[PDB]
Amino acid sequence: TYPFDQNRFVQYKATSLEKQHKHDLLTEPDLGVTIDLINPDTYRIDPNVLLDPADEKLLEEEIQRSQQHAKVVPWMRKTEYISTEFN
């Protein structure tokens, strides 16, 4: 046999695997939001609400393509129809 080295340490190292791990945010079992109905001392229900376009975008789930229609392509023109004003 060949005396292969026993992998008793880390020398690759495993830095490529530990940094890619997405650790979940479990700071509070209620997902960082207190579930209660007594604490809401203050309110923002009155007209001309405190809100921002940054907040507005966050209300949607998923809304956020084929961009090549508007390519130059020097060998491709545009179309022409029937006016009532010409030579």
Partner 1 sequence: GDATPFNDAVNVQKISNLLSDYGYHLRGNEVLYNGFTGRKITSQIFIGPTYYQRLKHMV
Partner 2 sequence: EWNIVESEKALVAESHNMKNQQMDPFTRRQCK
Partner 3 sequence: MIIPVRCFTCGKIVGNKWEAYLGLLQAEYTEGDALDALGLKRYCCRRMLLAHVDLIEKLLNYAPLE
Chain contacts with partner 3 (rule: CB under 8 A): 66, 69-70, 78-79, 81-84
Residue 65 or 77 with smaller CB distance to partner 1: 77
Q: Which of 4, 75, 81, 86 binds partner 1 (CB under 8 A)?
A: 75
Q: At a CB cut-off of 8 Å and minimum separation 6, what does 32 contact? A: 25
**CB distance 32 to 25 below 8 Å:** yes
Name the nearest CA neighbour of 59 among 47, 67, 51.
51
Site for partner 1 contains 73 (CB under 8 A)? yes
Residues forming the site for partner 1 (CB under 8 A): 68, 73-77
